[PDB]
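#help-structures
NK: newbie question, is this the right format to request a structure? protein is Galectin-16
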Amino acid sequence: MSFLTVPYKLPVSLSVGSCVIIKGTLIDSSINEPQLQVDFYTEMNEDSEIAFHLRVHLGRRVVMNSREFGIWMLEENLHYVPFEDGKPFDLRIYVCLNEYEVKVNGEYIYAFVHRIPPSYVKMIQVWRDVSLDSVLVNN
């Protein structure tokens, strides 16, 4: 079947114990835009708060942040970038009580402490030049 059309938006309801599972392929095809971006919004509106932001600059960093009252807050940077041009990835984001646990290809890579309660997230958007197989939320 066909890759999901990006930018891809999905209405969701997150609780503690939820898991967002994103499977796709990144490619080295942009000048200074990230190759993958995942934003968790508090409304089905792109001006609303971003409880959780993850983006991938291949060979450089994975960056996580939040956008609260229009302001991009403290960037948390990983220099472990388990993403590779043209290889399929398995990105799992688990909702725990105090943090999202970010897991890639079966590896625990980062715990991002909640800045907005995850129960306020209403919409997930996955975009940048990603070839997206699936996005789904398990309870």
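mod (FA): yep, format's fine, and the tokens are attached above. The chain is about 0% helix and 50% strand.
NK: thank you!
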